[PDB]
Every structure is written in structure tokens, then in C-alpha cells.
Write a protein that binds this ligand. Structure first.
Ligand SMILES: N#Cc1ccc2c(c1)[nH]c(=O)n2[C@H]1C[C@H](c2nnc(-c3ccncn3)n2-c2ccccc2Cl)C1
Ligand SMILES: [Zn+2]
Length: 203
């Protein structure tokens, strides 16, 4: 029951998500090893993701979290990257697929820097890069990120686990140290925008 709405480049909604993507790029510690070398994107397509059931799932969980966090959901708009964006927009996030050996355990990972999430698009550590060229810094192949509504609630701070600690609803990690956000229940995030893009070759 997912509908995708293709947003026009003239749309203020398109532009707002576009700006968030470009402006949150950072120069990574790994020198581009995981996600490639770039300081900007070619943004190709922004699609609003509309799924009533996934939204109801999300708001139902948000109510419970808010009750346990002084009536505040601690909601954030965050990026997600993984090879499984197609599955998520249709079925929602699903912690049953989370990697037990994750830095912060078997959760679903989000970032406030688009470039951080970009590092996970082809897998952990950029995996083996694009399928066609096996190139983690591929400028040719089109990538996709999600820009998601995420309920953090009472977030447990951690440095570099299967559920949040008691009384908490997420983990905020700081492993240059950028923030990463981890949820252990898939219904705490709604995949709001599907972004199709390329990393741009610098010059
Ligand atoms: N088929 C199928 C399928 C596969 C995965 C699904 C999924 C469906 N629905 C999901 O929500 N997922 C999430 C996306 C994936 C994920 N989210 N965050 C991470 C990550 C990020 C950074 N460090 C450590 N783990 N992963 C993940 C989990 C396992 C391998 C690779 C990745 Cl990117 C689990
Ligand atoms: Zn490629």
C-alpha cells in the first residue's frame, strides 16, 4: 500500500529536502573509503513515500514513547542508508533484519549527516561498492537514501545490545566524531522521502 509521489525541483518540499542533503555533507575520517570522495551530490529525484498503515504503526508507537519521555516524542528528521531501501518503503523498517555485530548492536541506524548514511548505501563500510563497478566511490551509479521521521524518545548515550536500555527508546552514539542514532523497533521510524542521487566528482 505504498504510494510514491515524485516531487518537482520547483517544489519547496523538494528544495527543503535537497538543501538538508547538501548542507549536512561532511569530510569523513576515512578519507572517503566507505562512501566515496565528494563534497556535494547530484540530486536526481525526490519522492514522497505515502503508506497509511506504516504511518499508523508509527504514530501508535510515538504515543507510548511520548508518555515515557515527559510527553515528548523527541522526533527528528534523519537519514538512513542501506542496500534495502526498496524493501523498507514497502514494508517499513524491521529490526528483525538488524546486524547483531553492529557498533551499537542489533538496531536500525540513522544519521543527521547525509554523508554518513551514504557510507552504508552499499553495505557496512560501503561493502563492496556499486554492483556494476564494485566501486565505493562510483560517480556513475545512482544511489538512494531515505530521509525519515524518527522517534528517539529518551535516548541512551553511548560510545563505540538488542533493545534500548530500560526506560530508554533509542541509542545516540558518538564513535571527527559524528552522531549516529539507533532504534531497536522498526515502527519508531517512518521512511518519509526516497532520494535518488549521485555523489559528485570534485573539481
Ligand atoms: N530483505 C530485507 C531487509 C533487509 C534489511 C532491512 C529490511 C529488510 N528492513 C529493514 O529495516 N532493514 C534494515 C536496514 C538494515 C540496516 N539498518 N541499519 C543498518 C546498519 C547500519 C550501520 N551499521 C550497522 N547496521 N543495517 C544493516 C544491517 C545489516 C547489514 C547492512 C546494514 Cl546497512 C536492517
Ligand atoms: Zn558503479
Amino acid at each position: 500500500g505504498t504510494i510514491l509521489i515524485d516531487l518537482s525541483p520547483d517544489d519547496k518540499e523538494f528544495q527543503s529536502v535537497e538543501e538538508e542533503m547538501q548542507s549536512t555533507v561532511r569530510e569523513h575520517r576515512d578519507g572517503g573509503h566507505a562512501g566515496g570522495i565528494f563534497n556535494r551530490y547530484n540530486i536526481l529525484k525526490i519522492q514522497k513515500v505515502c503508506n497509511k498503515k506504516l504511518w499508523e504503526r508509527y504514530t501508535h508507537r510515538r504515543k507510548e514513547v511520548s508518555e515515557e519521555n515527559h510527553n515528548h516524542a523527541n522526533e527528528r528528521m534523519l537519514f538512513h542508508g542501506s542496500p534495502f531501501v526498496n524493501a523498507i518503503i514497502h514494508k517499513g523498517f524491521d529490526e528483525r533484519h538488524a546486524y547483531i555485530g553492529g557498533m551499537f548492536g542489533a538496531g536500525i541506524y540513522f544519521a543527521e549527516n547525509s554523508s554518513k548514511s551514504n557510507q552504508y548505501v552499499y553495505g557496512i563500510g560501503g561493502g563492496t561498492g556499486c554492483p556494476v563497478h564494485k566501486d565505493r566511490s562510483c560517480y556513475i551509479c545512482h544511489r538512494q537514501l531515505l530521509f525519515c521521521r524518527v522517534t528517539l524518545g529518551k535516548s541512551f548515550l553511548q560510545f563505540s545490545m538488542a533493545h534500548s536500555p530500560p526506560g530508554h527508546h533509542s541509542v545516540t552514539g558518538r564513535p571527527l566524531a559524528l552522531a549516529e542514532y539507533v532504534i531497536y523497533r522498526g515502527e519508531q521510524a517512518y521512511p518519509e522521502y526516497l532520494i535518488t542521487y549521485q555523489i559528485m566528482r570534485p573539481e
